[PDB]
Design an enzyme around this catalytic site. Structure first.
Site, PDB file in Angstrom:
ATOM      1  N   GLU B 123       0.879  -1.157   0.000  1.00 31.84           N
ATOM      2  CA  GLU B 123       0.000   0.000   0.000  1.00 31.84           C
ATOM      3  C   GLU B 123       0.917   1.208   0.000  1.00 31.84           C
ATOM      4  O   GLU B 123       1.793   1.316   0.865  1.00 31.84           O
ATOM      5  CB  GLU B 123      -0.836   0.001   1.279  1.00 31.84           C
ATOM      6  CG  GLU B 123      -1.871   1.104   1.386  1.00 31.84           C
ATOM      7  CD  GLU B 123      -2.687   0.995   2.671  1.00 31.84           C
ATOM      8  OE1 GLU B 123      -2.477   0.003   3.408  1.00 31.84           O
ATOM      9  OE2 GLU B 123      -3.518   1.881   2.972  1.00 31.84           O
TER      10      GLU B 123
HETATM   11 CA   LIG Z   1      -3.256  -1.147   5.304  1.00 32.72          CA
END
Ligand SMILES: [Ca+2]
Ligand SMILES: [Ca+2]
Lengths: 132, 128
Positions: B123
């Site tokens: 991420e």
């Molecule tokens: Ca996360």
């Protein structure tokens, strides 16, 4: 534009998948002095400094997640600002076995002194200082 | 005595192939691969690093159950997120979703997601 430089500042958080969330939360609070926090829809994280570890319960994980979630698959090194010898005494007092330490090792910023132990799932935890 | 942790210095990723992994994190996330110790390899960013182990290589001590593709990491960037997403996409990396609103350690963040060569979930996010 042209020639954009991709650059990462830091790791904000990571997700540990654990056998039992209550066991893990209790362990990290008592042993590493972290703070258990509740966020979102009954999610649990452990705060240290300005970052955190999110916890997922094995068999009840949230999507998307790691391709191959696995308990006991993490190997983490944390810096403490406490005197290392006092930290090690504190960890032992919680009934934890110090595997090795104090010993000279390599940190991101140069030489560190570390000691090692296992968490409840067998994750390897290294607690370290940059102090002489 | 009051036990307390400041921050994470580094973590070890166990990967199928170090060279594949190095090329990915250097090109896609702009990290610097460095050698240290006795033939060890690490990826540097900010004041942290990721140590790499190749599955099958002998090392001790390590995670009880080392596993490729078992990590789930959120990195902060100070670049504009749309530039970072264009960069990643331009390296041939599939964007899974983004930009989407998520939660970081210090409050709300905006993120996008993709996988590394082993399936670790990555991420990339901003607080801005
Ligand atoms: Ca996360
Ligand atoms: Ca280490």
């Amino acid at each position: 534009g042209m020639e954009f430089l991709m650059k990462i500042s830091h790791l904000d958080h990571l997700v540990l998948t654990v056998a039992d969330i209550p066991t893990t939360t209790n362990f990290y609070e008592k042993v590493l002095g972290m703070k258990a926090v509740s966020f979102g829809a009954g999610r649990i994280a452990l705060e240290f400094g300005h970052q955190k570890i999110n916890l997922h319960q094995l068999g009840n994980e949230f999507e998307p997640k790691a391709q191959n979630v696995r308990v006991g698959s993490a190997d983490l090194c944390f810096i403490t600002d406490t005197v290392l010898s006092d930290a090690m005494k504190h960890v032992e007092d919680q009934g934890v076995t110090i595997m090795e330490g104090p010993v000279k090792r390599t940190g991101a910023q140069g030489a560190i002194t570390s000691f090692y132990f296992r968490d409840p799932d067998g994750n390897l935890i290294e607690v370290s200082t940059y102090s002489n």
